[PDB]
Amino acid sequence: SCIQFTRHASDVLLNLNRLRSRDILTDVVIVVSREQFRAHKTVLMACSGLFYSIFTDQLKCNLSVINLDPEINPEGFCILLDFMYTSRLNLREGNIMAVMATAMYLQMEHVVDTCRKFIKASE
Amino acid sequence: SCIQFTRHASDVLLNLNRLRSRDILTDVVIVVSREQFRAHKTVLMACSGLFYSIFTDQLKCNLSVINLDPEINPEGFCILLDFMYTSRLNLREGNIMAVMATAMYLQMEHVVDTCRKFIKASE
């Protein structure tokens, strides 16, 4: 018997992104080589199998800094972090390989699938 | 030049709700008279003008317990909290007045609007 507000989920994500831009209640720093990215643990877990495993680990859940594998490209991470908070993926010919390798590491199957399709079409 | 994954926002909300059910990374207890509700501060702020004001206040942002006005009905709050995490509002004839008064207090304009329309149509 429920009614549903169609735009609710996108509005929530819009506000979580505004919180991220203003640095409100961000509780983790993701270190990708020389770069730091402030984020909300719950949004990372809700989007990534890797962060879901990290932040449900009884020891890692309490860490304020998570260092990613040095093989991870910071631009690739940046694009995936923007995707997490906006549903929009800035996929380009110059970044697709780094985006795909980063999505595989972060466990983001939908991004991996779209990257594979854009690669196969070119091819 | 971005591409968009249509279901991303609803999937994120689905996962935030699964985190809430399992009590993962919940960081605030909302006390509504005799009842307690565990939630994520960021989801509350992203959905409610009242929680947005509370959790951006330099002192209240650090509180782990927020007590609501004793006039607030716990079932009404419960229904709005489920709406926040699911986009579905369990609106019924027996709960509509409490739901509407709670949405006005929490500052959730879209819920207030739909409640007003269901009231006007009846009557």
């Binding site: 429920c2 009614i3 549903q4 507000f5 735009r7 | 579905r88 879209h110 739909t114």
Partner: peptide, 5 residues
Amino acid sequence: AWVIP
């Protein structure tokens, strides 16, 4: 907006 889901 509101719809029947």
